[PDB]
Structures are given as C-alpha cells and as structure tokens.
Design a binder for this molecule. Structure first.
Ligand SMILES: Nc1ncnc2c1ncn2[C@@H]1O[C@H](COP(=O)(O)O)[C@@H](O)[C@H]1O
Ligand SMILES: Nc1ncnc2c1ncn2[C@@H]1O[C@H](COP(=O)(O)O)[C@@H](O)[C@H]1O
Ligand SMILES: [K+]
Ligand SMILES: [K+]
Ligand SMILES: [Mn+2]
Ligand SMILES: [Mn+2]
Ligand SMILES: [Mn+2]
Ligand SMILES: [Mn+2]
Lengths: 270, 270
C-alpha cells in the first residue's frame, strides 16, 4: 500500500460534455479503447505517511464526482478545492454530503471569490438552510487566491497548494502546484506572474482541448508550445475533447508527453 | 426494433446518494449483484410509430443523466420533464446542451412553478446569458401543474402526460401517468385528488426508500400498502436506498411487485 508519498489520481480527463458526448458521439476517438471514455476533469490528491494514513483532497466536484471517488477506491475525503465555477467542475457538489456525515464535521471547501460567490448563488442550500427546509448545511468555505499558498491538514499530514492565476476565455481559473506536480485545466493563457509556479515541474498536467483553436482552452499545439517552454520532466494532457484520440495523440506528442486517461495514477516523493 | 408502442427505461432507481454511496457503502445490498448498483432516479419515456420513428422524453436530469442516456442507446431527446427541484433530479441539467446543438432548437423543459423558480435560481445561465458571458441559453421553459394534462410532440407522435400532486415531506413533487404506466418517485403521501391518476395502472413505478420510516418517502411497507389499495397489474419499486437489497426485496414482496434495477425496460401498447 502507499507510504511516505503523495499520490495523484486523474479522476477525469475529458471536456465539458465528456467522451463520448451524451448523444453517443465519440468524435475521432476509437470507441474500442477504454482510455477514450472520459469523465469530467478532476484530480485526486493524497498524502500518505509512514503507516499509510492519508490526507485526501479533491480538485473539482463535477457531475462524475461520485463514480470517480467510488472507482478510486478511496473512501474518505478531507477537503474539496475548486478551479472555477463551470458546470463540469461543480455540479456534483451535493455528493459531498456523505463525507460530512462520516467526518462529523462540515466539508471544508476552498475557492476564490468568483467561484465562491457563484456556488453561493446556485448551491446556497449547501451553505445555509433556506426558508421552508430542514436540511442542515454541509460545507465550510475557505478563501483562496492566486500567489497565496494554503495547506490542508489530515491524517497523512498537511498538503500544501500553491494557487495561481490562469486566463480561461472570458473568466479566470486557478491552477495549483502541489510539490513538483502542477495542475492546469481550463486555461487559454498563462499570465506572466504565474510562470514561476508552472516551470520545472516533475509532472505538468495541462489542458489540451482539441486540434483547432478555441477561445477558452489551449489547442494541442499550444499546449505543446507551453510544455517546450516550461520543461516539465513529464507532461500529461487533460480536458481532452472528442477530436483527440488516445493512441493518435500519444504518437503526435514527444516521449515525455502523454494524453491522460481516467484512473491514471502515480506516486511521488513528499 | 420497437414499433407501435411506448417504451419505458428505468434509467435510475436509487436514492439521492446512489448505491453504493460515494464512500463505498453498500448498506445491506449484495455488492456482487449488479442490480444493486443504482444511479439517481430517472425514467426514459419513448413512443415508437409503425416505422420505428421515436419521440423521446426524460423524467428528471440528475447527476447520472449523461451515463444514463449513453447506456440507454437512445441518442436523441425531445424534452425533459421534472418532478421537483432536489439535487438528485436536476444537477445533470447542463448535459442537455448537446441535444440543443443536434436539434437546432432550445431544449423544451417542463416544470411546475416551484421547480421552475428553483432552476432559474441555480441554473440561470441555461435560460439567460448572464453579465460577462457569451454562452447562449439552452432551455425553453413550459409550465405544468397537477391535474392539467400536457402533450409532447415528436417524430413518433405525441406523448400525453397526466401530472398530479404528491406530498414529499416539506415540499410537493409531481407524479405522472403516461397511458397506463404511472411514475411516482419522491412521495411520502398521496392527496385524495391524485388517486384517480394512480389507481388501476398496468405498471405502477413507485418509490420505496427503505424499511424504516422516513419523513420524505414511503417505506417499503407503506409502498406495499398503497400497491394493495391501487391494484396495479405490476408494480416496480424505485428510489431505493442502501438498506434495500434486490434479491431480498424480491422475496419480501408479492409476485406482481418487484424492486427495479437500472436499465429495466418494457414496452406497452399505445
Ligand atoms: N454561467 C455559467 N455557470 C456555470 N456553468 C456554465 C456557465 N456558462 C456555461 N457553463 C457551462 O460550463 C462549461 C464550460 O466548459 P469548458 O469548455 O470546459 O470551460 C459547460 O458545461 C457550459 O455549459
Ligand atoms: N434546497 C435544496 N435544493 C436542491 N437540492 C436539495 C436542497 N436541499 C437538499 N437537497 C438535496 O436533495 C436531495 C434530497 O433527496 P431525497 O431524499 O431523494 O428527497 C439530496 O441530494 C439533498 O442533498
Ligand atoms: K508521446
Ligand atoms: K416479488
Ligand atoms: Mn471545463
Ligand atoms: Mn471551464
Ligand atoms: Mn430524490
Ligand atoms: Mn426529493
């Protein structure tokens, strides 16, 4: 079992409608390769101590969150951290409820002001009981902001996140460095001040939506341009839409670069 | 292939956290029986004509909606109809977007005032582009109300729904009769005026949450009491929580009564 490490699980590596889309559209993906079946983008972050006790933090709770956690085999959760308030990253939020019961404590969630204010609007009942309801709240909100590190405590010891700003079309999203692993989904440009957090990563997990330009995400070409500049030891592509077939993208990319797949899992030193 | 019929698919038959819960809790369900793996409650309703053209209507779009539709093998959708605005019935709403593109038309959705006003609050961007966004709306709203039949048109011909009031703890939910098939989820009591819609069904699909009383749902015993009173030819239990194991409930219930399972599918005459 895992010991003395951080462990990362790519819970989902698809674009907002998943692969295939709800209408059975696989695009250019080989439907016979299980790696092309893609849930919505999310990352599990764990820290294990010397006895195998873990601290568990999820990045984003999209609609696939429940199945992602079940399939991960990890049955406890200390916190959720949010990138930005788009459907595919937040609409599985209600499923945090079970852990609140298990932990005997509100679920700590971490979000910037933009994300937090949208969650309040759309999932107010998770924070405050509305008129005419008996459901207690389930979440405890913590602010995060680019360039301000924060740490989440748990049974495995603390996990320190370094958030930073990303341009995501018409809005801002957050990326995070955790040790020498960096997670950059839903990003169309990196601001100059964010570069320090993204360069020289052991593992850079970076969104590449499709081949053609898109206003809100890097194309594969743009992602690769960034990877050449930032010199990660290994890169893993995420938030991949239906034009991007696993085997195909594997061939089209340098040896140290690969398309992700759901369930992709690795350990690193702490 | 189906012809000259209505076809019903039980897309999901679980309680709000699914079976197992997100933490891997199966309760008393046999984890080795695939029928005990339960997605959130939803019903697919189709009408096929003599050439196999279909009209397709979903009841509720919970978080499992995308996988439910993919697994159903049905790749088009004419409308969504809503029972009530609880997470497990609405939080997969964004995934209607693909069909809007396919159909070239906003997705017609049907909801009562209570449900509609909550959807507006929490998923406003689906109806109206907010400040600072370029995303067009995706939904077109239609009112429904107990005791007022409504029909949805499509390639297979019209599907006529007869909505009626249900008590669901502290709120009201809707049930629906479609021909001689009746769908009653999230119900703790039936008002006297609703009884005409529920009696003498060919197939009564009725929520039974667990063995012990619950303020918002019928227990198994209460569901069975109702079934004895309403004399459906066949009953199928839905919205079943982790205390209710498939094989076990199968034995505990009369011959004409069965626990549902995800993917349960039948055709009836029009
Ligand atoms: N105002 C909004 N709030 C939440 N989700 C949105 C909003 N506008 C669009 N979306 C959804 O957010 C996702 C955008 O996907 P992405 O291409 O991954 O940035 C899609 O699921 C959209 O339908
Ligand atoms: N105000 C609310 N709006 C939407 N969903 C809610 C609200 N309050 C509770 N819920 C969720 O609705 C579901 C209630 O489940 P049920 O037992 O099937 O009626 C659970 O997912 C709750 O977390
Ligand atoms: K490669
Ligand atoms: K039986
Ligand atoms: Mn996204
Ligand atoms: Mn996004
Ligand atoms: Mn429910
Ligand atoms: Mn409910």
């Amino acid at each position: 079992s895992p010991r003395n490490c951080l462990r990362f699980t790519l819970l989902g590596c698809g674009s907002s409608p998943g692969v295939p889309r709800i209408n059975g559209d696989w695009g250019k993906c080989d439907p016979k390769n299980p790696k092309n079946r893609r849930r919505r983008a999310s990352l599990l972050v764990e820290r294990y101590d010397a006895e195998g006790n873990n601290t568990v933090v999820v990045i984003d709770t999209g609609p696939d969150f429940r199945m992602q956690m079940i399939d991960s085999g990890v049955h406890m959760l200390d916190a959720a951290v949010y990138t930005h308030p788009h459907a595919d990253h937040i609409h599985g939020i209600d499923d945090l409820r079970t852990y609140v019961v298990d932990n005997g404590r509100l679920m700590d969630v971490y979000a910037n002001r933009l994300t937090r204010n949208r969650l309040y609007d759309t999932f107010g009942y998770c924070f405050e009981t509305p008129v005419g309801s008996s459901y207690p709240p389930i979440l405890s909100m913590h602010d995060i902001a680019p360039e301000t590190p924060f740490s989440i405590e748990g049974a495995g010891g603390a996990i320190r996140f370094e958030p930073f700003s990303q341009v995501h079309g018409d809005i801002e999203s957050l990326g995070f460095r955790i040790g020498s692993v960096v997670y950059c989904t839903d990003v169309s440009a990196f601001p100059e001040q964010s570069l320090q957090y993204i360069k020289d990563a052991d593992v850079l997990i970076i969104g590449a939506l499709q081949y053609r330009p898109h206003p809100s995400h890097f194309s594969l070409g743009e992602a690769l341009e960034w990877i050449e500049k930032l010199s990660p030891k290994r890169a893993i592509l995420t938030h991949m839409h239906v034009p991007l077939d696993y085997e195909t993208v594997m061939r089209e990319t340098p040896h140290h670069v690969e398309p992700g797949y759901d369930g992709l899992r690795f350990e690193v030193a702490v």
